[PDB]
Design an enzyme around this catalytic site. Sequence first.
Site, short mmCIF file in Angstrom:
data_model
loop_
_atom_site.label_atom_id
_atom_site.label_comp_id
_atom_site.label_asym_id
_atom_site.label_seq_id
_atom_site.Cartn_x
_atom_site.Cartn_y
_atom_site.Cartn_z
N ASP A 285 -21.67 -33.28 -11.18
CA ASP A 285 -22.93 -33.54 -11.86
C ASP A 285 -23.25 -32.31 -12.74
OD1 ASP A 285 -25.41 -34.72 -12.67
OD2 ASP A 285 -25.70 -35.53 -10.64
N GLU A 491 -35.29 -38.04 -11.63
CA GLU A 491 -34.77 -36.99 -10.74
C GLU A 491 -35.94 -36.26 -10.04
OE1 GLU A 491 -31.12 -34.87 -12.27
OE2 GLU A 491 -31.20 -36.35 -13.88
#
Length: 602
Positions: A285, A491
Site C-alpha cells: 500500500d 480511510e
Amino acid sequence: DYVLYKDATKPVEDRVADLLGRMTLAEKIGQMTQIERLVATPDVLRDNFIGSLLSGGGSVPRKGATAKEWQDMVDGFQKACMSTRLGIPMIYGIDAVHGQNNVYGATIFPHNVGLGATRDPYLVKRIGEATALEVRATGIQYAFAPCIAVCRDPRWGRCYESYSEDRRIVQSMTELIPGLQGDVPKDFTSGMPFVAGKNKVAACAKHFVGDGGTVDGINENNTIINREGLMNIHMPAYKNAMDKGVSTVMISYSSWNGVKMHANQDLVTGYLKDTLKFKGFVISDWEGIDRITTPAGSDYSYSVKASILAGLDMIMVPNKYQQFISILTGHVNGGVIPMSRIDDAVTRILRVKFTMGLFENPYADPAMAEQLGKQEHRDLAREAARKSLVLLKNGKTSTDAPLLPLPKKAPKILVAGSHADNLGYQCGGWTIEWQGDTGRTTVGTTILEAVKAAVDPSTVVVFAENPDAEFVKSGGFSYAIVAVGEHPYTETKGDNLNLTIPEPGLSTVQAVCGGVRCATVLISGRPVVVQPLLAASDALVAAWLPGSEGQGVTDALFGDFGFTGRLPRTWFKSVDQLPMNVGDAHYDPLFRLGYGLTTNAT
Ligand SMILES: *[C@@H]1O[C@H](CO)[C@@H](O[C@@H]2O[C@H](CO)[C@@H](O[C@@H]3O[C@H](CO[C@H]4O[C@H](CO)[C@@H](O)[C@H](O)[C@@H]4O[C@@H]4O[C@H](CO)[C@@H](O)[C@H](O)[C@H]4NC(C)=O)[C@@H](O)[C@H](O)[C@@H]3O[C@@H]3OC[C@@H](O)[C@H](O)[C@H]3O)[C@H](O)[C@H]2NC(C)=O)[C@H](O[C@@H]2O[C@@H](C)[C@@H](O)[C@@H](O)[C@@H]2O)[C@H]1NC(C)=O
Ligand SMILES: *[C@@H]1O[C@H](CO)[C@@H](O[C@@H]2O[C@H](CO)[C@@H](O[C@@H]3O[C@H](CO)[C@@H](O)[C@H](O)[C@@H]3O[C@@H]3OC[C@@H](O)[C@H](O)[C@H]3O)[C@H](O)[C@H]2NC(C)=O)[C@H](O[C@@H]2O[C@@H](C)[C@@H](O)[C@@H](O)[C@@H]2O)[C@H]1NC(C)=O
Ligand SMILES: *[C@@H]1O[C@H](CO)[C@@H](O[C@@H]2O[C@H](CO)[C@@H](O[C@@H]3O[C@H](CO)[C@@H](O)[C@H](O)[C@@H]3O)[C@H](O)[C@H]2NC(C)=O)[C@H](O)[C@H]1NC(C)=O
C-alpha cells in the site's frame, strides 16, 4: 539475434524467463518500483527503468480532464518507458473502486456496502465489466480493486469499501474480478494471474489480510484474532480471488496479532505464495513499508529489507523512488537480499504484464475514450443503486397506509435535506478527490434532479435544503422526500466512534416529517444511530452511498421497481455494543443482517 521475449507467439513463461535473463540489477529493481505521476518525468522513468506508475486519490492531470487528456498523460509516460534498452512497458494503476472514480465524467457506481445489500454477484460482475471499459477509456490498465475486507466494526472509516460483515457475501462478490479482468479459461489453474486483453484491466484483491478486523475499527491498526478466526473470516475470499485469476494482491497497513502485514513473511510468502499458489504480483500500500516502523519512515533501510524479504514484489513508494532504489540496490549488492528474491518479484511482475497483453498493446486506444460515462454504464449504476436500497420502515404503525411507493402525480411535493441536492455527498469518498467532496463535483443526477425527472408534469416540486416546521406545515405539500446523512470520508478520516450523522440532519427530518408525511433517505457508508430518524419518519430508506445515478433512488421511491435490498451488515442499537456481528454470543441488533422490507412495483 532473435529476441524471444518480444515474440507475441511465445508462451508467457518463456517470454518472462527470456527477458529476466537479460536484465541488469537496475532494470530488475526498476520493475519493482511504482511511482506517483506527480514525481514522474520522461528522464526519471527511462533512467530508473521504472516498472509502474499510479495516480493516488485525486491525482489527476487537470481538474475536469477529458478521457483523451488521461490517455495522453499515460502514453507520455509509456513512451519514456518503451524507450529504455529493453523497452518494458510500465503498468499504470489507480483506485477505480466504484467506477473510474478519480475521473471527471466517469460513471460512479454505489460503494461496496450497498452492492453487498443487492446480493447480486452477476450485477457486480457487470459493474466490473463497465469499470474496466471506463478505466481503459483513460488509458489505464490496472485497477486497485476489489477491496475484499470483511468489516467487523462499522466504526472503521473503510467499512463502506467492504461488501459485508459476512465473508460469504464478500466471497460471492469476488465476481467483480472476472468482470474487470475477463473470465478465466475452463483449463485455468487457481492462483495464476489473468487479464483477457486490451479491453480489460488487471485487478487487485485487497488488503491482505484482516484489514476489516482491527480493534475498534481503527484504520491501519491491529487485528487481534487467532489463526482459526483469521482463516475462516478474513482469508476465504482470497482463495475465491485465486480461483478467478486475480492478477495482483495489495498488502494491508494493518497488523495481525502485532505483526505488520508489510513485514509478514509467514502470511505473504508462506501462505499467499506457497500455499494458495498465487503467481501474480504482490504490491504494497501507499508508504506501506514506511509504516512498518514507529515512527513511520524512521528506518527506511529496515522497511525495504523487511518488506522485500517478507515477499512483496512491487513497492508503491510512491514519491521517494531515489531512496527506495538506492537502498534496495545496496541490500542486494551487500548480499542481505538474495538475487532469487529479486528474480521472483520480477518474474511475477513480468508474468502479469506479458499475460495481460501489455507488451503488445502498451498504448491507449483513442476509440475507447467514449466509454467514459457512457449511458449504458449509467443505466447499470442506476440499476445497482436501486437494488442496493434497504427499506427499513414504511409506515409509523402496523395500521398505517404504506407511504412507499409514492404517487408521481400530486399537486405539490417537497424535496429537502443537506443530501437531497448534493452529488458529492451521494457519492461519498474516493470520488474526484481522495476524501470525496461537496456539491456538483462531476456528471450525475442528484435526488432532487431525479425527483423532477420522475414526476408527472402537473406536480410542483419545491426544494428547500433546511426548511423550518412552519414552512412545511403551510406549504400545501402532499408528501416530502428528505435526504440526510454522512459527509464524504476515506480511510482514517472516516474512523468514527459515535456514528451519529452531522447536523442539520435529524433536525431537518424532524421539521419536515412534523409537517407532512415523509420518506427519509439516509445516505451513509455504514449503519449509523438511526432510532431518532426512525421515530420521526413515516418511511426510511438506507441508500448507502449510491453514486452518480440518483434516479436509482427515485426508481424505488415512486414504485417503478419494488425494494429488494437486504442489510449486508448488522444495524446496532448503540455504539457501546460494538463490535457486534451476526453469530456473536451477545447479538442484540436493531435490525439483523439480512433485514429488509419490500414493496411491489406500481
Ligand atoms: C462523531 O465522530 C466524528 C469523527 O471523529 C466527528 O466528525 C468529525 O468532526 C471533526 C470536528 O470535531 C471534523 O474535523 C474538522 O473538520 C473541519 C471541516 O469539516 C467540514 O468539512 C469536512 C470535509 O472537509 C467534512 O468531513 C465535515 O463533515 C465538515 O463538513 C461540514 O459540516 C457542516 C455541518 O454538517 C456543513 O454545514 C458543511 O456544509 C460541511 N462542509 C463540507 C465541505 O462538507 C475542519 O475545518 C477542521 O480543521 C477539522 O478537521 C480536522 O482537523 C484536525 C486534523 O487532525 C484532522 O485530520 C482534520 O479532519 C471532521 O471533519 C469530522 N469528520 C467527518 C464528518 O467525517 C463528529 O463530530 C461532529 O460532526 C462534525 C463535522 C462537527 O459538526 C462536530 O461539531 C460534530 O460534533 C462526532 N460527532 C459527535 C456528536 O461528537
Ligand atoms: C412483490 O415483492 C415480493 C418481494 O420482493 C416478490 O417476491 C419475491 O420475488 C423474488 C423474485 O423476483 C424472489 O427472489 C428470488 O428467490 C429465488 C429463490 O430463493 C431465487 O432463486 C431468485 O434468484 C430470487 O432471489 C433474488 O435473486 C437476486 C438477488 O439480488 C435477491 O436478493 C434475491 O432475492 C423472492 O424470494 C420473493 N420474496 C418473497 C417474500 O416471496 C413478489 O414477486 C412475486 O412472487 C415471488 C415469490 C416470485 O414468484 C416472483 O416471480 C413474483 O413476481 C412481488 N410480487 C409481484 C406481483 O411482483
Ligand atoms: C493502534 O492505534 C493506537 C492509537 O492511535 C496506536 O497507539 C499510538 O501510537 C502512536 C505512535 O504510533 C503514539 O503517538 C506517539 O506518542 C508518544 C507518547 O507516548 C509521543 O512521544 C509521540 O510523539 C507520538 O505522539 C500514541 O501515543 C499511541 N496512542 C495510544 C493511546 O496508545 C497503536 O500504535 C496502533 N497499533 C497498531 C498496531 O497500528
